[PDB]
Amino acid sequence: HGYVSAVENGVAEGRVTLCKFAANGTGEKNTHCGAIQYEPQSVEGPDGFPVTGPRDGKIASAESALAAALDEQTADRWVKRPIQAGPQTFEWTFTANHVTKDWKYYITKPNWNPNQPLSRDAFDLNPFCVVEGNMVQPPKRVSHECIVPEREGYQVILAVWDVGDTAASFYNVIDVKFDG
Ligand SMILES: [Cu+2]
Ligand SMILES: [Zn+2]
Ligand SMILES: [Zn+2]
Ligand SMILES: [Zn+2]
Ligand SMILES: [Zn+2]
Numbered sequence: 001h002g003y004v005s006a007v008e009n010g011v012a013e014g015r016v017t018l019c020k021f022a023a024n025g026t027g028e029k030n031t032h033c034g035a036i037q038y039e040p041q042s043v044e045g046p047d048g049f050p051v052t053g054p055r056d057g058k059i060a061s062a063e064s065a066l067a068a069a070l071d072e073q074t075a076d077r078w079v080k081r082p083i084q085a086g087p088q089t090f091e092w093t094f095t096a097n098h099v100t101k102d103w104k105y106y107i108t109k110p111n112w113n114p115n116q117p118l119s120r121d122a123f124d125l126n127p128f129c130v131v132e133g134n135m136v137q138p139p140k141r142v143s144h145e146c147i148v149p150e151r152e153g154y155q156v157i158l159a160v161w162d163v164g165d166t167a168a169s170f171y172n173v174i175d176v177k178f179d180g
Contacts, residue, residue, distance in 0.1 A: 001041035002094030004172040010091025012081035014172035016040040028079045036067035041095045047167045056119035062171040080177035085150045100133025101164040108156045135164040152180035
């Protein structure tokens with residue numbers, strides 16, 4: 001159980017995180033998140049993305065009933081956090097810091113459709129950033145350096161935390177805004 005945060009040096013909070021915690025600087029929160037807003041750490045779903053894992057249209061929720069609200073996808077739906085290309089630090093907070101296989105970060109294709117539910121077609125399915133967890137428990141807050149690709153405007157980053165001793169993973173989409 002954990003979520004992408006911006007308490008120490010993280011660049012951008014997860015979508016689900018912003019249902020509970022105000023964004024740095026702007027103070028913005030996501031709304032109408034449903035029951036997951038109580039527990040943004042709980043976006044757990046099937047292992048094996050992208051070959052298996054959550055099916056198209058249920059990536060953002062990870063097929064969680066509590067988190068079904070997160071699958072909505074429009075231009076106006078979610079709080080966007082500024083980002084730039086190049087080195088950036090991603091952060092996780094874990095309420096339950098499970099033994100970890102790895103963390104993987106995926107970004108939307110430039111011309112992804114921000115008004116359709118997320119699907120594999122929307123993403124570059126080759127992670128732009130992979131951090132190994134080595135089947136040990138991480139600390140309860142961690143930071144990951146990632147080299148982020150160029151994009152213009154609104155892009156989504158899918159952060160996947162793969163638990164090392166179970167057939168589950170945690171899935172946190174991040175709504176980001178590049179310049180342009
Ligand atoms: Cu957990
Ligand atoms: Zn796995
Ligand atoms: Zn549509
Ligand atoms: Zn690529
Ligand atoms: Zn679990």
